[PDB]
Symmetry: D2
Subunit: 452 residues, 4 copies
């Protein structure tokens, strides 16, 4: 089967909007086969360990509503995965789609030679949106690129000052490209690619005592710290809330040593935590702020790295010191400008706070009833996780929830934990259903384990 | 005009309003251009305004890009229309707002633009099938991402995961090379000014002259001797940002044989040369070389979507099977980017645009080389392959003069990141024959103007 | 500006001269200063004046006086409370070591390095029997920093196939100045100009076991597992910093728990200085690898040893050329070491080190009370001691004042002005009392000096 | 036994000038035992592979004459090993022993606080002995310490100028401490200890274009080369002679790129190649010269790093930046000064030119006659090598030479090669004996490869 035939077969599929039964049965086996032969057979296996029966091979087809997804069989799922923090303003949010639609009619990608208007507008808007002295935005295409940019700003500012050491925390996830992977803390994700960047070190998350010692020792030996990088709340780490006061203490510690503070809000950002940015909870201003995922409104890929003029100015003298080819393209800018408008207009952060309190209270109730299965439920706003007693019970919860057409999934740096990350637009009724779905799942799990 | 003390909501409202405008008034344009410049100075980068001043004359620096004109042209806020010989630096291979491409994206946007990353997502599966079929020999598996630097990051990681257990950690790249600006790709990238401020980079990255098989062999052999064995060699088939440097005949074939001999992986960076630009779908098809890993981006997104693809043999890509989360990316291979790439692949094959690049590139280069002969006064030489081309001038200034002059004649050109004497000529492969003649015409006109400028 | 031959000739005649009348003395001193400036390091002249009075800066040393003194070219005798920073544990020209070196010089000073050399095998036997527990094999080299290099290389060769590559040291630590040792050495000013050093060296505060556990734990979580931990039992160049009781034992257990190797650096604390033969004997702690030098050469030869368990050292068995050095374990060096071990054990010098050390520290602690004026505190263990002063200048003055009194002391590399007191373990009881009397008059003069201003 | 006991036995053995046949047997038995149990069992296996059953046990006991050694069984060996380049003025050279004795009577080790006069004298003498602008000496204890000082000198000089990279050559042996080992090029000596110092690269020895390339590529990528380090003739590499003009072109290349040139003459130095320093064959002045081995007259361990005032001055403001504890002690200096006197008085470097040519004439003659055994013979002054067809044949030669009481040994970075590296004081008569034995060895070797 030649390339031309495949693209042709592919374009027709793209132009369909519904599938008759045989078209659907045929599409499914294609997708599985091609996943096996040309994507990654191991994904099919993972999907199996977290589902029951032929559910593993559920093929997704379209958005059903703001908060639901429909597979090729017409089956509709309430989305509690949120694409791991992407779909904050729902699937195919009308305002974001319209913005992207309109801009596509003019220009989707720019020449990168001329001044592009929306980059300017998104930079102005993010300047306005962000705390304090954060003034300048570099645009890129992803969370990991966003962090690459932050690291490079820190390096360019700090290396002429003789500081080269970066401190991150264990449990941290910061991206998978090799620069970001150097801060990313999970052993498994790191070792096969060593050596990574030199001069990266890790302290326990949420522990200012340990961090203070890290910086002190680095100073004594002339390996002075250039920057500290952390998530305000560790995402892939299993939704780990630092003790109240931590972020502020990290901020003070960085001030004292003249280290930069990098906040990775790729997952906590754009309202997910009940505020626009998680750092607004303790009102901490980083020197550099990393955004992505939800910044594209569920429609476009985009990352943004926002820093003070003091830091960002290292890119002024030679503007080509850091670039990327698609970064801040018009479609992506359109999407993010829409998203920002939607979040503020509909006060989605406050909604995240209220829906989050509600779900977590529900999950904490269920935790009380099933301590044979559940360890604890935790979270802030619409970033939640349920930790289970062990991995297999976790994988069974995800499976039982999928069976009830509610999408959930695990976290990258914590195997016992299932995240709950719905769109901030999840309705009150859907919230209750998600609780009811979790209850049935736990009851079923009791039976399955009890007999076994 | 929109206040300094403006709420985020207000800014977003203002911006959403502008997005909805199909056409700009004169006084609307005057206001928008003022905002954009101001916000560039204050929120993007004041330096990029300074740069634009150095490749334009007078007020041209403030040119604000506004929309596609036709397939091969762009229109600024003033309504001025430009023939595009820049091509988003290798992006716009099938023109601006290519109908088939825009169509696919639009169609996919109606279903689901971004995926959950949990369920099996069909356009990923399909673009992987398509690419496996579009690529030489044993290239079978694809990883999808959002840019060329991500494509290269994935390539280096694949090599690393494959070679690490075999005890090999060293990477060989070439001077002049450009592979990205993320810190991993940047280790392979070769320009001193893009690298130094960010050192230390990845350890164990070394460089040899591009085109020099003996130099490479010496690198690999010496690394073998010292127990610093080479994991992979990474190179472009033709150095783009280096200034369109073509290697000697058989070099790629030779690099392949050299990699086979040493047990190194061969990575080909076709982020710029790929998707038909140099006269074939992939530049490695000119010598018929099969790399172990092939990097794609830029033009793969049809000039509508951002996308990167990293494609490898099953033998190499299998390092990702036991643990499919070993390497991931949030947005990678999302439905929009896939639809865009599938459409682009279809367009390219259908209209035989790789063959068009050969012919239109042959025509253009030939005319450029002719201008080179007539104006040795200003021009060092003209080189290229398919629609990837360069004019090298005798100065640095002359090249900026030429850029400035061509802009004045509403033809878009720009310089290369690793060569300050070179102006690239990188038009859509859909550039009409008429538009070619105009380009040479403008090139001649500019060279003439530049000649009399000296004689002031 | 003579010829090389002419220069060497002059030097040989000087080497033959055992006495210098007033004529030769001034010519010599003038030469030595001039050549230091032009061919050695003009900066040592600056430092020396920095810690001397008037024309004390130009004190050219000439020969040993007695066990515990040095005489300069002007016939000025100094009591040695410097000890070559831990070298002269058995005094200057100790007859038993001097003799053993002459006897060996008469036979063979250096060896072929191809035939089995007896004194290397004998010394290894002797150190096996002198060292704690499973410490069995010895690698011989020429200096403290060389012995640390061998120790890093052993740990590396052992832990590399086991997948561990990170090394933990302590701040305040000093392990040598060759670039491998320098990676574990902790003083910023000694390290910075020579970076990048070896990757994967990290530092925890000395004496803080919870801090060390966190570092090992975190390195583990991220897949940068610690191969080894290196430390001095007592930090020397750091300023005689004593760990809390049980800390060394806790480091041993922590290492045991993480499967990291323990490297104990006793280059300075070893050969009796702290009251035992090895400082690790106070708590009965067995390192996997133990480093020795300085005093191991009896004050006559340069030598270092790196001693390890058969477990660790066996990495060198299959390829005995994997780690070597050219002069390492030569007959002269071994002869000196064997004589030194004999003198220490026979004359019970570590027990003496305890007694004299206590006597001296008492003395300094009393002076500390009488002069909070000038003295922060005095601390020590055995004959490894330090007086810490208020100012770094107050202290330069103490050193400079003691020098006028023909008592020799000097600073410590890591800290700003702490004076180490590291006299031969053979300091007489009477000499001890003179050192305390001198310290007193020095502080007295310094106080008067602070007024009168 | 206790440690006191052992030390006592050892001090009795040291005082013994000669051995009873039973004392000899007991000493030999105990030496092999302690080598096995306390030194390295492998070195005993190594000796076996280069001796004929039983000879491996030989325990060396004393210098015989100036050019011979005597084992415990009174067996006397002509020394063509030279302690791998140590014994240039013979064993127990009377002028060197005398010097060391006399200084030992006064003060063997310095205080490191008072100015020690022989340090001054040796640094003066070295400054006189060295080419051109070489002026300042740092004294240490070995070749590898000498290379360490050289690397640090280059580092302290070049790091403030933005240059951190080092170029060495394949085949190179520069020492085994971890800084020097970073330059030392033999795979087998390097891998188990990696990661070494970052930024060390290797080009092939004697290839000038490959070095221009490496220097220029490093300039291009911003990894500018701080120093180039090389032996004038690779020693452990198998006596590898660069083409005429190579060394000088390397010096000019360094000038061109502003890299410091470090010449490692730890083995080639002090007369061995026919000149006092091998760099004198082409009148090259490095920025930093490294010396050791024979610098201590075959009596003391000593190393020296000599540099231009321009380079060495990096240690002037803080003379404590780089030290070693025993470096430059009166004994080592006395030995070094005596050795310089002997070599100059007796015209020994020149003797090495004549004797080397004469010995290489014999070996070249033998290579003609035994092409079944010998690939080629080569040398510069008294630094010679015989390359055989196999590693095997080489081992056999070393063994046959050992039976004949002529001591030779292989080279660390070359398996087919046997070094011939005698004192420069080797007599003409002994030169003829060495050639006779080599001839005999080859004969036995031949007739015994034929009974196979
Ligand atoms: C604990 C410790 N470890 C290593 C060294 C270095 O010894 P060296 O023989 O290579 O110099 C030392 C040495 N310290 C004092 C510096 C002497 C020069 N003033 C040590 O204490
Ligand atoms: C050229 C060269 N450079 C350094 C060294 C190492 O000096 P060392 O005094 O630390 O050993 C050498 C020495 N190699 C021969 C020793 C082999 C084992 N007997 C050298 O040739
Ligand atoms: C905290 C954090 N940082 C960075 C990233 C990298 O994002 P991407 O996968 O888009 O590169 C992620 C993705 O999950 C994340 O959760
Ligand atoms: C060959 C090559 N590789 C990689 C890149 C970088 O990819 P991106 O700019 O999309 O991150 C470029 C960009 O010009 C390129 O030409």
């Amino acid at each position: 089967a030649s390339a031309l035939a495949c693209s042709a077969h592919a374009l027709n599929l793209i132009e369909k909007r519904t599938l008759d039964h045989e078209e659907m049965k045929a599409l499914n086996r294609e997708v599985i086969e091609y996943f096996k032969e040309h994507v990654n057979p191991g994904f099919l296996e993972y999907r199996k360990s977290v589902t029951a029966g032929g559910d593993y091979g559920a093929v997704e087809w379209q958005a059903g509503s703001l908060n639901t997804l429909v597979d090729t069989q017409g089956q509709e799922f309430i989305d509690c995965l949120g694409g791991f923090g992407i779909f904050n303003v729902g699937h195919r949010n009308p305002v974001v789609v319209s913005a992207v639609q309109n801009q596509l009619a003019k220009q989707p990608l720019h020449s990168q030679e001329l001044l592009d208007p929306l980059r300017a507008m998104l930079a102005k808007t993010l300047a306005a949106l962000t705390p304090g002295k954060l003034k300048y935005s570099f645009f890129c295409n992803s969370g990991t690129e966003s962090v690459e940019a932050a690291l490079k700003l820190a390096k360019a500012y700090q290396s002429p000052r003789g500081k080269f050491t970066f401190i991150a925390t264990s449990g941290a996830f910061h991206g998978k490209s090799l620069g970001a992977l150097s801060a990313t803390a999970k052993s498994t994700f790191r070792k096969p690619f060593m050596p990574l960047l030199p001069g990266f070190r890790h302290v326990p998350f949420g522990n200012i005592e340990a961090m203070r010692t890290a910086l002190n020792e680095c100073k004594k030996t002339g390996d002075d710290v250039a920057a500290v990088i952390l998530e305000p709340i560790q995402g892939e780490g299993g939704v780990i809330l630092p003790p109240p006061g931590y972020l502020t203490a990290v901020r003070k510690l960085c001030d004292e040593f003249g280290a930069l503070m990098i906040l990775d809000e790729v997952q906590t950002g754009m309202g997910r935590t009940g505020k626009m940015f998680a750092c607004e909870h303790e009102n901490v201003q980083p020197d550099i702020l990393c955004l992505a995922k939800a910044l594209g409104g569920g429609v476009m890929p985009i990352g943004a790295t926002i820093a003070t003029e003091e830091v960002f100015s290292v890119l002024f003298d030679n503007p080509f010191l850091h670039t990327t080819t698609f970064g801040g393209n018009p479609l992506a800018c359109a999407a993010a400008l829409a998203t920002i408008n939607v979040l503020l207009e509909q006060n989605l952060p406050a909604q995240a706070e209220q829906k989050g309190d509600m779900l977590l209270d529900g999950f904490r109730q269920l935790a009380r009833e099933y301590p044979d299965l559940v360890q604890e439920a935790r979270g802030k706003g619409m970033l939640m996780a349920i930790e289970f007693v062990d991995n297999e019970i976790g994988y069974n919860f995800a499976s039982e929830m999928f069976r009830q057409r509610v999408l959930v999934a695990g976290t990258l740096n914590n195997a016992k934990t299932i995240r709950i990350e719905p769109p901030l637009t999840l309705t009150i009724e859907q919230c209750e259903l998600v609780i009811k779905a979790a209850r049935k799942a736990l009851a079923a799990m009791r039976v399955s384990v009890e007999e076994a």
